[PDB]
Subunit: 83 residues, 7 copies
């Protein structure tokens, strides 16, 4: 799952499911033991923000040919884990 | 009542009654002794947010075939318990 | 006056007069000596929120057959007591 | 001037002049030496809130037959005293 | 310049020039050495609030026959002194 | 460049270029080593506020005959220096 | 990449890619180890603000003949690095 994209501060980067999302990266300021990579959760569309796919960002591919969707949100917006 | 869904931070996950709700899970940051699982309370529709049922989240079932409704809200939005 | 409904945190639960209200329950976080149960006060309709009657909440009765009206508000919204 | 109405917390209860108002009661949380009962001040209508007269509150009289007007506001909204 | 009107808390009372204003009174909570009475400054109309002239407040005169205009604002809204 | 106008608190007074501006005065509460007088910077028109020229303020001249434009803004609105 | 423009406080100055951006300068108040110059990231257009190119600011060139686009944003608005 690891690509070149990391969450900073109190943010968390998730990956949308084929909004159900999976934790991909947890910012270093998110309190320890808050959640873990791989954890599935649910966030309202209005609470998360789409993040450009690292390939598009690293100028390799075009948005259209990217299937995986990365989103971000502050950790305080996460209410649960299906864990 | 325990399914694979837990509240994090200062949130609380309730289950709507057949808005009258029952505490299902209390975030680890909610002050100790605030409330207990099983406790019944009332919250204005505008204060709570619907949470996808863990089966829908874990991709097992379809929303339509789920009867139980999970909602979440910050603990400070809870004013009372019918306890 | 005691029914199965208690105020939590910094909230206060009052009962509307036949908005003139009477303190019914004071949250454990309301500063000590702020007010007392039985105290009469006045709050603008816009500052308080209606709370479902514990019987309706505990599924015993129907809203229509309930005369007593419970409301809630944060303690900082209370400016005086007719004490 | 003392009727059964007291200011709580950081609020202050004034009485409108026949908005020019006179301090009637100072909440226990208003910093000591902020103002004194009897002090005259001026507040914009939008900063203060009307408070039901204690007789109306204590169900003795009707609003119409009350001449004295009580209002409230947070102490930080008070900029001066005509003292 | 001293009339019966004083600034409280973090407020400052100025007198509009015949918005160019002159400091008339500095609230006791305004940090020491912030400004001095007599100091001229400039504030946007939207940052200040008109204060009833102490004579009108003390019921001596009518607004129309008052030429001096008193205004108030929080000290943090003051950016400079023409000193 | 020094005229009779100084910045107070956390504000900074700049002078618009013939929005490109030059620091003219730094409030005593702006953290030490934040910037220096003479420093050129850029601020969005919406972040700054026009300040009356000290001559207009000190009632010497008319706005129309003033070419130099003074503006102010909180130091936290300054992102860079062309230094 | 170094031109005469530096980020102050908790801001960060980036350079838009030919919104994908590259860190050009990190304010001295941005927590140590937050990011590094040269790091690529993605920010929503609404979170960043355009900054005048230092040449335009230093009055050398005209906006039209500048290709490089500098933008700024608070460090807390940065969720990831394609690092």
């Amino acid at each position: 799952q690891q690509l070149p994209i990391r969450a900073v501060g109190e943010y968390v980067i998730l990956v949308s499911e084929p909004e159900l999302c999976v934790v991909h990266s947890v910012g270093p300021d998110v309190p320890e033991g808050f959640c873990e990579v791989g954890d599935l959760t649910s966030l309202p569309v209005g609470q998360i923000r789409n993040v450009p796919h690292p390939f598009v960002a690293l100028g390799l591919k075009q948005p259209k040919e990217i299937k995986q969707k990365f989103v971000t949100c502050h950790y305080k917006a996460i209410p649960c884990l299906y864990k």
